[PDB]
């Protein structure tokens, strides 16, 4: 799981969730999509 308080790969764009690397942000950010997705708690965009 979350094994490691700061990680540091070789991309610029690497996934915090996971721990998965990706090349461009676009792939990241519909990536970490995988892992979002959950009752509402708290108001953050509306
Ligand atoms: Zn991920």
Redesign the pocket.
């Known amino acids: 799981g979350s094994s490691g308080s700061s990680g540091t790969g070789e991309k610029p764009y690497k996934?915090?969730?996971?721990?998965?690397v990706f090349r461009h942000n676009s792939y990241?950010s519909r990536?970490?999509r995988?892992?979002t997705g959950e009752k509402p708690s708290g108001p953050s965009s509306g």
């Open positions: 996934c915090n969730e996971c721990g998965k990241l990536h970490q995988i892992h």
